[PDB]
Design a protein around this ligand. Structure first.
Ligand SMILES: Nc1ncnc2c1ncn2[C@@H]1O[C@H](COP(=O)(O)OP(=O)(O)OP(=O)(O)O)[C@@H](O)[C@H]1O
Ligand SMILES: Nc1ncnc2c1ncn2[C@@H]1O[C@H](COP(=O)(O)OP(=O)(O)O)[C@@H](O)[C@H]1O
Ligand SMILES: [Mg+2]
Ligand SMILES: [Mg+2]
Lengths: 471, 51, 578, 470, 193, 193
């Protein structure tokens, strides 16, 4: 460990890969240091080792490397990250090195960045409702503490704004659930892969304005940073998040800026290695790799902390069936999908409820958690909005004047829903306010049409007017 | 009016989308053939040079 | 034994040299930590080993030791009420030994070696025993667990242990040739357990879901596939089957899926009630969990372990329901391994033997006469997760060619929160005709006629929807508009079922029959009224429409009175309309 | 005999054996492991250095130290005899009915020698399947290849069993005809499940149809090479019987989709580059070598007729399997999912169905003089009725013309009585009688496609007088 | 080889009014026909064979159905030649292939037929060449290219499909033979999508 | 290198009403103008070169027509600089690698243009960079990777194409230079799908 062994005899450099021929000592997955003739040192990882040579993926660019003066030295057999409680308020690059000018962290522990799978016996049911302040999330796609709830975005859609708003407004409601009345804020771990300066500056200014920097750990890999190092950024971020949550009882919110950029680096490595691909050239093991990333959230029996993940990914050409959003949806516990059509109409946040989903919603809503009518109201809203969308489709064929009164009522319900429930701007709505708006919208429909809602709830809440909330 | 709309706007549009999807699928088939040829070449090279 | 050293490491694949004499699909201990692996290729002095555990940190030159045996499971008392990993390691013991994380190289017995069981012998010295015969009885959560002779063992009984308490390692029966039979035996997971004879399917597998139990039934020995995109309801459907089905034993295989879904079962099932034994629901359940972030090579192992345990419980004379949470993950794992093997892939990168593997897995189901002369059955419901929701993908098409029932899920139905979201047009069942005598004897003599009438109404509605999407629903005649509205009633009040509702989660066959009878009576009365000039616009406003719509949420014991009142109201309301 | 122990490579279905240049290409070999168990294999590549063997079944017990390979036969041959009637086989000739193996009169290579075109003659005699929608409108001719196109949930197996049970020749209608010509059925099932296997066994045994049938049953979990060999063994038996014993043989191939999937899997396992949509580039030639083994030969009394059955993967007619089958075969019988879901069995849809050789096998001295015109009139009237059925949904029944209402009633009666025959075995005379009763619902003179003589002879009768049930 | 290829000056008279008047083909020209089922293609093909102003007929069957090839091989000997009253077969060469014959023969059938036609042209005659299905020949070509592991173009066909079709069709034409006489080859190809 | 990146707060006035009003781009921002052939990408970029409020314009003709480069070279000296009154060519730098010039130099041209723009930004000027078509640069990358026998990602492009594009576009921005003064780079890249 204290001794340093060097390997010359590099025989091949191409793209992100480097071959060294007399390195049977190097372990699989080991982290190495690549030093050229100028003395500059770059990092790498062993991805294949044999008696005759080893394959190393280079984290930085390979400019200036040569086969005569470059040497490879072993750093550690297993990729580990020094973690500490002092990491809060610090900023790091994609490989965990400080970039704020402060001295390096003194590690309390060194943890393997790949982590270990949580034992399902040791897992706990994610149950604590989180009030994000956004009605389309709180009412219809409820987020609970410990969930993996990504945001499916497009090229021009304000996903970063929505994530910042959620981080700013998210809170539990102990008064509703009867839990311990505490006001402990979320610790935020922010992992950026291939982020542009425009988005990074917005995130930094939002966190500074909210005062969340002192409770945040930032791992920033910029769009001009090396691409291959993006493989490590989510892993280091999630290692820090798990350490905080399950050793110091923090409630950690993890934001991953663009999983699309992570998948691009994964595809680059896979293509360089001639892996058998899935669809559209992505490696077959993309599902397993994304699973090893996403599955690191949740809650643990006996422990008080939690890890909540909100990954963000831009769907290419707004295609939900693209491999990246497809596999993410297959792994995560629902998704929040943005609509370009809603965005073009000035609606913010442009969350489309129909393709959105929350798998853990049923665990955190109902009597004794938010309110007794929550699930039925959500179901009724979904059915009524889908009916309105279908009637919109019918209108394009037969014209609005030919509609019956039921179809016209559903069309007006869909319009008012989009304009008042989805469109909320930057305001922070409590769950009670959101349910009041939902019931006001549902009151537009005849009382007999509400098949999803029990009659006692209808008697309790039906009849209130939308003008009473405003105007 | 409905007959003319269906015969002029709707059917040609659907036909164009069908053609586009067919072209994309055929492109993907050609790329898969290229990959399979490369894989077979690598297998033959390894077998015939170092077994 | 064969002992080599590591030559090459690349992900889950290890090449070991010096392994001449090793056999294919034998289990090997890889590295100094003794990681479990399997030989999948022999080439000269080297062997290709897929490792069922993480390989990070392994170094070239570490020993590889072959056990000389293929992958096997311990079959005996102590498997119920437990959760296992892909290679049958109890996860509770691992949690005790390791903590909240799963580490490498943990060695734990599948069956507890300390727990004592109340042995009750049934054979006597001098008896001739054959494979599959019952040697004795052990109680387990209200079950009578039968200690079976291993399928390949014959001989005459020399001595038996008297009634008492023993561990599974105690040799309760000793044969004349000296072999000692214990409470448990091992079986290779890739070998199907032999049966005396296969039987024709004649009894239904009651899932508790109206659409599956009525329109697309599956027999007790049958196979069903439920493909669909993400968020379409595959997991909720399979967990509803695990909760509500009439199987004696349920084996749930979480192949490559979320760990929270396994935690859901682990937390809820102990608090739920078994539909027939009255005890906790978890006492009849065996969980095999290999989550998506667990090692990829263990997914196939988990599938085979689950199917072998199901066959064992079938051999004990039970009817077993096997739920494979995703066979697509098994296919993906095969593709990942074939990538390291550098094989020539078939369509979409899957290895050519994928269809053969799937057919072999699905053909293990069936109602059989066991080697002991009893009657048992295995029902397999495999979920398929096509990439992008493309049902033309190789795994879905391969499964289409071997399963008896096909329950296609629709993304559009799931988007509008219409559940179970079964695509009626794309679904089918091949067990409908064989189950008709059982329906006549047990549900009603005219139940098949009602089911056929409902299916015909749905087909007519599907035919009319083509015209509706062209000219709108208001351009139809009153009879066709009535067909459209009755189809909507059928979809919203019969086909729909809320899995998380306190009452609608489970539906009996007679309750579904009553709902169908009410719907058909209403349709007949409406067609009669329409034939004499009654406007459809006022038929739809009858309160009996709402009564039929809310008949779903009526409890089972209160349902017959509700059904009688609804029938009377159906007659009266259309009597009132002139 | 000679043993080859120089095994140097085992992976998947393949194994390499050295110093085996004495093994001919395509030979069948026996692989014996260290435990004495014997597996079968086929030589797929021979060279001076080593031979490549594709192994049947799994390779679990095999190791490079104790495995040996020995030759079984240079060419895959099948022992054929007339005693094969009433027997069941597993697809590679092994009995699976528990009866003693047959004593072969001769052993024939299962691969098909092409028929010389100058030796073939024109198919001109029909086969009575007992199904009206086939016999009347899509007649099967001796020597024809008429496939059945079905879907995943459609009852293709039931129709196959019904045809195998009911098929017969009608020599009494052939002018004078041979008073008795032998008739046999060869049933080849590929990739079927255990449920289908048991169904076929019961269907063949419960009525005695087995006594004139030879069954080749390959299961889904059986080796894929056996699935590849199954149709060739069936066609070898069919050719032997027809052209050495003057039998009229009807061959039913229960699922060609499974055969094509097995062919794709075998091609991938042999490192072949696939053609269109992942299927082998030689799939058309393979399907031709299967299909083109049927026909009638000049100077021979026997015949071979094929009814391949295939499930279109997504009801897509343009899929390579149904597309190439339509390229090679003479027409198709299409099953209708709408008819099946309306409770009609057999769910044969006459409109998309077609028999290309039908005209050569019907008419005076073959079935009856009015057959062709009746079939044409039925087709036109049914098309008119199904179109008026869609029109009535928007415009209503009262707005229809009287003849339109007559066509509307005709379509419903045709579906209920002609197509929906259940398990009845209808003679061609009974089917023509039902067709004429259905045409009588139309006014005389609206029957444009039928000559006045036939109309005068057969028009007028009611459905009630001759129907099986109301 | 020929001395010189002549211009399409004189017509190829098929004896059918619609073909000879509305859509004429020049002597040595090329025509394409589709073979849809139930169109009478075989009647028109054999009528063209009987009544054309060609001395020699060459009929090429590339991978036809067994029964259709049998139909051709049975009906053609029964046709009578109006110029002599004897069998039409006395002035035709039939090339017959079924779908189950070797793919090499099915691919080479049209070249064999066109070579025989060119030989009879070089004798100074006018030759009518009929290819019953160039689609089946193209299927055989596609199979051969797939066996060669060549990258396909469009629907699995080799990129040189058009080159081979042109090499077949451009052998037609009215020429001055090396012997100084005049001869022509007129090709009527058939397509079955 | 720069001292610091700053958030762009002043508009890049292109002189076109629709771009300057409906879809503005900031002075240190980036924009893409994809379109088919004949849609106006070059006219838009040359209008930006003529009329924008940038101090220095770097125009990169990556794999385009030589007539357009001649077009610029001929008219720009006779035009007037909007903010200095001199010839428009005096504030312009042209990098031309036409479509028939060597393909590998297309990639070099983009980097040369962006580096020159960065240098003029470091001098405190506000620079506008027009890339005539990044699709030709992508084609050059595809050809090079094809010669390297690398596994293509999608449509034949190398998997690192997105990384190269992102690295190129990230060079734009309003910055504080190492000398302490203010400069900015605006990149308008045209795409030819
Ligand atoms: N703003 C405009 N005002 C006037 N004419 C215009 C304008 N934009 C385009 N045009 C006309 O359209 C033609 C095509 O424009 P341009 O050369 O810029 O195309 P382009 O989109 O760059 O195409 P390509 O990819 O073929 O180079 C111009 O030559 C001109 O005639
Ligand atoms: N039968 C049902 N009743 C109520 N909700 C359902 C039903 N089926 C599915 N859902 C909803 O769909 C969501 C996702 O379903 P899931 O089982 O995860 O589908 P998949 O396994 O195909 O991803 C669940 O959160 C659940 O709320
Ligand atoms: Mg699921
Ligand atoms: Mg241009």
């Amino acid at each position: 460990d204290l001794l340093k062994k060097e390997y010359t005899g590099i025989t091949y450099i191409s793209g992100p890969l480097l071959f060294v021929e007399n390195a049977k000592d190097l372990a699989y997955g080991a982290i190495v240091d690549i030093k050229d003739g100028t003395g500059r040192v770059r990092g790498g990882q062993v991805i294949e080792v044999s008696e005759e040579y080893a394959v190393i993926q280079v984290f930085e660019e390979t400019t200036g490397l040569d086969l005569a003066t470059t040497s490879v030295s072993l750093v550690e057999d297993v990729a580990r990250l020094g973690v500490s409680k002092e990491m809060l308020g610090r900023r790091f690059n994609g490989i965990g090195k400080p970039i704020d000018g402060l001295p390096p962290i003194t590690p309390e522990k060194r943890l393997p960045i790949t982590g270990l799978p949580l034992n399902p016996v040791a897992r706990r049911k994610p149950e604590q409702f989180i009030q994000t302040g956004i009605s389309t999330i709180d009412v219809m796609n409820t987020l609970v503490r410990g969930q993996k709830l990504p945001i499916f975005s497009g090229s021009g859609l304000p996903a970063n704004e929505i994530a910042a708003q959620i981080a700013r407004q998210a809170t539990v409601r102990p008064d509703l659930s009867g839990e311990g009345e505490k006001e402990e804020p979320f610790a935020v771990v922010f992992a950026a892969m291939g982020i542009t300066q425009r988005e990074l500056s917005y995130f930094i200014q939002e966190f500074e304005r909210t005062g969340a920097l002192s409770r945040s750990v930032l791992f920033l890999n910029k769009a001009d940073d090396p691409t291959i190092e993006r493989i490590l950024t989510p892993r280091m971020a999630l290692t820090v998040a798990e350490y905080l949550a399950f050793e110091h009882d923090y409630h950690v919110l993890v934001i991953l800026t663009d999983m699309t950029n992570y998948c691009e680096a994964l595809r680059e490595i896979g293509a360089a290695r001639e892996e058998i691909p899935g669809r559209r050239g992505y490696p077959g093991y993309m599902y397993t790799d994304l699973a090893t990333i996403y599955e690191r959230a949740g809650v643990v029996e006996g422990k008080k902390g939690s890890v909540t993940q909100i990954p963000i990914l831009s769907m290419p050409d707004d295609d939900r069936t693209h491999p990246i959003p497809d596999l993410t949806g297959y792994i995560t516990e629902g998704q929040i999908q943005l609509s370009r059509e809603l965005h073009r109409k000035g609606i913010y946040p442009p969350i489309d409820p129909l393709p959105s989903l929350s798998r853990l919603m049923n665990n955190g809503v109902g009597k004794g958690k938010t309110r007794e009518d929550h699930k039925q109201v959500s179901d009724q809203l979904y059915s009524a909005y889908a009916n309105g969308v279908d009637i919109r489709k019918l209108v394009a064929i037969i014209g609005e004047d030919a509609l019956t009164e039921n179809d016209r009522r559903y069309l007006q319900f869909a319009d008012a829903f989009e304009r008042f429930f989805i469109n909320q701007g930057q305001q922070n709505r409590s769950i009670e306010e959101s349910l009041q708006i939902a019931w006001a919208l549902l009151s537009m429909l005849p009382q007999g049409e509400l098949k999803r809602i029990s009659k006692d709830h209808i008697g309790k809440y039906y009849g209130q007017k939308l003008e009473e909330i405003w105007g | 009016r409905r007959v003319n709309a269906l015969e002029q706007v709707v059917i040609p549009g659907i036909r164009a989308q069908i053609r586009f999807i067919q072209q994309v699928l055929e492109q993907r088939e050609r790329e898969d053939t290229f990959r399979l040829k490369r894989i077979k070449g690598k297998i033959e090279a390894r077998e015939a040079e170092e077994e | 034994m064969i002992q080599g050293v590591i030559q090459k490491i690349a992900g889950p694949a290890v090449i070991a040299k010096g392994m001449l004499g090793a056999r294919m699909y034998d289990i090997c201990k890889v590295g100094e930590e003794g990681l479990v692996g399997e030989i999948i290729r022999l080439d000269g002095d080297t062997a290709f080993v897929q490792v069922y555990e993480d390989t990070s940190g392994l170094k070239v030159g570490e020993p590889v030791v072959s056990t000389g045996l293929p992958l096997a499971v311990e079959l005996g008392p102590g498997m119920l009420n437990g959760i296992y990993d892909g290679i049958q390691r109890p996860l509770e013991r691992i949690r005790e030994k390791t903590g909240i994380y799963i580490t490498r190289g943990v060695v734990v017995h599948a069956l507890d070696r300390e727990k004592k069981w109340a042995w009750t012998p049934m054979v006597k010295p001098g008896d001739e025993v054959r494979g599959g015969m019952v040697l004795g009885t052990v109680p387990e959560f209200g079950f009578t667990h039968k200690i079976l002779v291993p399928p390949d063992v014959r001989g005459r009984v020399k001595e038996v242990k008297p009634a008492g308490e023993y561990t599974v390692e105690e040799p309760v029966v000793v044969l004349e040739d000296g072999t000692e039979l214990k409470m448990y035996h091992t079986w290779p997971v890739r070998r199907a357990r032999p049966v005396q004879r296969k039987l024709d399917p004649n009894t239904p597998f009651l899932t508790g879901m109206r659409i599956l139990d009525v329109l697309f039934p599956v027999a007790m020995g049958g196979t069903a596939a439920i493909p669909g995109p993400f968020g379409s309801g595959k997991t909720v459907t399979q967990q509803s089957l695990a909760k509500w089905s009439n199987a004696d034993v349920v084996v749930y295989v979480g192949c490559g899926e979320r760990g929270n879904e396994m935690t859901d079962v682990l937390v809820e099932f102990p608090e739920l009630t078994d539909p027939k034994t009255g005890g906790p629901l978890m006492h009849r359940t065996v969980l095999i969990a290999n989550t998506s972030n667990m090692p990829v090579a263990a997914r196939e192992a988990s599938i085979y372990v689950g199917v072998t345990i199901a066959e064992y419980f079938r051999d004990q004379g039970f009817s077993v329901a096997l739920m494979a949470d995703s066979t697509s993950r098994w296919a993906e794992a095969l593709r990942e391994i074939s990538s390291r093997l550098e094989e020539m892939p078939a369509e979409e990168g899957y290895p050519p033997y994928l269809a053969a593997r799937l057919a072999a897995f699905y053909e293990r189901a069936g109602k059989v006469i066991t080697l002991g002369g009893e009657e048992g059955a295995v029902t397999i419901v495999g979920a398929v997760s096509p990439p992008g929701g493309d049902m033309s993908e190789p795994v879905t098409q391969s499964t289409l060619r071997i399963v008896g029932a096909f329950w296609r899920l629709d993304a559009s139905l799931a988007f509008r929160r219409h559940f179970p979201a079964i695509n009626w047009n794309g679904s089918y069942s091949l067990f409908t005709s064989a189950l008709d005598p059982w329906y006549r004897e047990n549900v009603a003599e005219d139940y098949p006629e009602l089911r056929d009438a409902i299916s015909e109404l749905l087909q007519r509605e599907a035919g009319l929807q083509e015209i509706v999407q062209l000219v709108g629903p208001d351009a139809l005649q009153d009879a066709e508009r009535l067909v459209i509205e009755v189809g909507r009633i059928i979809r919203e009040d019969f086909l729909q079922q809320n899995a998380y509702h306190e009452v609608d989660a489970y539906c009996s066959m007679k309750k579904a029959y009553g709902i169908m009878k009410m719907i058909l009576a209403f349709y007949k009365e409406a067609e009669a009224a329409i034939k004499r000039g009654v406007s459809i616009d006022e038929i739809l406003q009858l309160p009996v429409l709402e009564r039929i719509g809310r008949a779903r949420y009526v409890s089972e014991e209160e349902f017959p009175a509700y059904f009688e009142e609804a029938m009377k109201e159906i007659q009266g309301a259309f009597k009132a309309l002139a």
